[PDB]
């Protein structure tokens, strides 16, 4: 029977019948599940001797501190696993009853409790976002450093599916080709809860995070570190969620870190979300002289070609930056940004084009000057600003379509134009009058300069209206106007000088400029003959 037994069934160990997991490890051949609780030292490492393996978690790994899981064959599976610390630290919950963030360093500390979740452990970061925290923190709530970490070291093609946790940590260090997929929803510790270094080695490529969310934690939920995915765009974050971030949503990092760079390039960011993150929605820069990098000789700084493919991507609540990147060549779309406490954008980008691009209600609290700011020559193709609640200052920026309720006064941008309309149509609600109006911002950014009017004579089903042609002087707007049909009387009122007409007040050759001589009650024409010459000559008289 044994030799027929060990031909027909499935392999697999259980950490039931082993007092380590190492034990459990070097005898595995096939499965591997994990059915018992097990408490792990913080550095416990296990060697799985290149077994591709099939790891089934249906218990937990208890621990402060990083289990570090070495030597998975290609192609290796990790599923259900659950991280949890044994230390219940003290965390601070920003947000209120009505999920309202609160802003006070009192308030904040004031939600102080001891949990492994609902909240985040206070860092440094949080000494600058609630000025004065510092100072107010308990000592025992300050310095914390609790994570129960998963770290996979040095492995190619292992991929970890469904992991959750309490104060959970996801770490790939010099991994290759892995991915963490439909994450269910771990609630973070005080590290990164995905992360990808590779500092050392070759730049990490084939690395991703596909579908899933996390909660909580108290620094970015993803963050990527010295990988390039390649012309291929292999790696990045696509379908997945991150809820209530202490840092960011997603972040890839910047500057060096150690003696070489953390920066990345060619990753792809699409079809993703991230709500309430405490800092930004998504951090994409690349710079803060670039050892490991390019020299600031070849790419300036913020002018890095990071390359990375960024599409459909919608971010709400964050307490500061919605959307921010830096990088030269870029191509962005279809991003949606509402609600936001900081700018819904803050672009440090050069020769860049963003299409459809949506900044709903941002700046709410005033952190920054602006909703979306673009320092370098950029394009924006689709603007839609202003919800229900300066608004962009692009100085170098040509930009066109924009659609929203902006106050004109609060946009600043290189050239606006919307050079392909068809024939228009300008249809007034609510009003006894329809507007085209012209401001030049050179001359007033607050001062409509003048104005083609249609408005009611009478009232409504009158069959009458009059159109109003004007001109803005002594800084009254419409101070002056030709009318046709005022009253319905069917003919044009046309303002003349006031006074004597200079030489110079007449532009044009073949034209004539009414003005008044008030000491014979004469209006006179100043008249610039087709041959330039100009001759004064009596238009009407008593």
């Known amino acids: 029977?044994?030799?027929?037994?060990?031909?027909?069934?499935?392999?697999?160990?259980?950490?039931?019948?082993?007092?380590?997991?190492?034990?459990?490890?070097?005898?595995?051949?096939?499965?591997?599940?994990?059915?018992?609780?097990?408490?792990?030292?913080?550095?416990?490492?296990?060697?799985?001797?290149?077994?591709?393996?099939?790891?089934?978690?249906k218990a937990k790994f208890i621990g402060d501190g990083n289990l570090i899981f070495t030597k998975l064959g290609k192609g290796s599976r990790i599923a259900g696993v659950f991280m949890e610390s044994t230390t219940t630290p003290w965390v601070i919950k920003p947000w209120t009853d009505d999920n309202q963030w609160l802003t006070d360093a009192a308030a904040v500390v004031a939600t102080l409790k001891q949990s492994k979740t609902d909240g985040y452990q206070?860092?440094?970061?949080?000494?600058?976002?609630?000025?004065?925290?510092?100072?107010?923190?308990?000592?025992?709530?300050?310095?914390?450093?609790?994570?129960?970490?998963?770290?996979?070291?040095?492995?190619?093609?292992?991929?970890?599916?469904?992991?959750?946790?309490?104060?959970?940590?996801?770490?790939?260090?010099?991994?290759?080709?892995?991915?963490?997929?439909?994450?269910?929803?771990?609630?973070?510790?005080?590290?990164?809860?995905?992360?990808?270094?590779?500092?050392?080695?070759?730049?990490?490529?084939?690395?991703?995070?596909?579908?899933?969310?996390?909660?909580?934690?108290?620094?970015?939920?993803?963050?990527?570190?010295?990988?390039?995915?390649?012309?291929?765009?292999?790696?990045?974050?696509?379908?997945?969620?991150?809820?209530?971030?202490?840092?960011?949503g997603v972040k890839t990092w910047q500057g060096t870190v150690g003696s070489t760079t953390s920066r990345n390039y060619n990753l792809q960011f699409r079809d993703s979300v991230v709500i309430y993150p405490v800092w930004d929605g998504f951090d994409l820069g690349a710079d803060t002289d670039r050892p490991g990098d390019y020299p600031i000789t070849q790419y300036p700084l913020h002018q890095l070609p990071l390359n990375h493919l960024i599409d459909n991507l919608l971010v709400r609540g964050a307490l500061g930056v919605g959307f921010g990147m830096d990088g030269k060549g870029m191509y962005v779309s279809n991003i949606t940004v509402e609600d936001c406490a900081g700018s819904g954008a803050y672009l440090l980008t050069h020769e860049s084009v963003f299409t459809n691009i949506a900044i709903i209600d941002t700046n709410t609290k005033d952190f920054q000057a602006n909703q979306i700011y673009i320092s370098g020559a950029c394009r924006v193709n689709g603007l839609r600003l202003i919800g229900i609640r300066l608004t962009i200052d692009a100085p170098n920026?040509?930009?066109?379509?924009?659609?929203?309720?902006?106050?004109?006064?609060?946009?600043?941008?290189?050239?606006?134009?919307?050079?392909?309309?068809?024939?228009?149509?300008?249809?007034?609600?609510?009003?006894?009058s329809a507007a085209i109006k012209l401001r030049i911002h050179k001359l007033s950014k607050t001062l409509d300069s003048g104005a083609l009017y249609s408005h009611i004579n009478g009232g409504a089903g009158s069959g009458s209206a009059y159109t109003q042609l004007t001109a803005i002087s002594g800084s009254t707007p419409d101070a002056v106007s030709l009318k046709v049909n005022h009253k319905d009387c069917r003919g044009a009122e046309i303002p003349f000088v006031p006074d004597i007409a200079s030489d110079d007040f007449i532009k044009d050759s073949s034209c004539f400029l009414p003005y008044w001589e008030n000491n014979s009650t004469s209006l006179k024409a100043l008249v610039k003959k087709p041959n330039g010459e100009l001759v004064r000559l009596t238009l009407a008289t008593l």
């Not at 160990?13 to 030292?41: E, H």
């Not at 300050?142 to 292992?158: A, Y």
């Not at 106050?407 to 068809?422: C, F, K, Q, Y």
Request: negative net charge; glycine residues 14%; contains cysteine.
């Open 397 to 432: 920026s040509t930009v066109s379509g924009i659609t929203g309720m902006v106050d004109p006064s609060r946009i600043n941008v290189a050239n606006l134009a919307e050079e392909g309309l068809g024939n228009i149509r300008a249809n007034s609600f609510g009003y006894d």
């Open 122 to 248: 206070p860092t440094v970061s949080d000494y600058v976002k609630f000025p004065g925290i510092e100072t107010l923190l308990p000592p025992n709530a300050k310095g914390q450093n609790i994570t129960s970490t998963l770290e996979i070291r040095e492995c190619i093609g292992v991929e970890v599916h469904r992991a959750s946790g309490l104060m959970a940590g996801f770490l790939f260090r010099g991994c290759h080709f892995c991915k963490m997929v439909d994450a269910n929803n771990p609630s973070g510790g005080k590290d990164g809860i995905i992360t990808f270094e590779n500092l050392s080695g070759d730049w990490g490529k084939g690395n991703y995070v596909i579908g899933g969310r996390t909660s909580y934690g108290s620094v970015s939920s993803i963050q990527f570190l010295r990988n390039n995915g390649g012309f291929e765009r292999d790696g990045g974050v696509i379908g997945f969620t991150s809820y209530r971030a202490g840092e960011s």
């Open 1 to 57: 029977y044994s030799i027929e037994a060990d031909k027909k069934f499935k392999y697999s160990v259980k950490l039931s019948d082993y007092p380590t997991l190492q034990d459990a490890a070097s005898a595995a051949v096939d499965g591997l599940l994990i059915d018992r609780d097990y408490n792990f030292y913080g550095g416990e490492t296990v060697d799985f001797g290149g077994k591709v393996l099939t790891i089934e978690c």
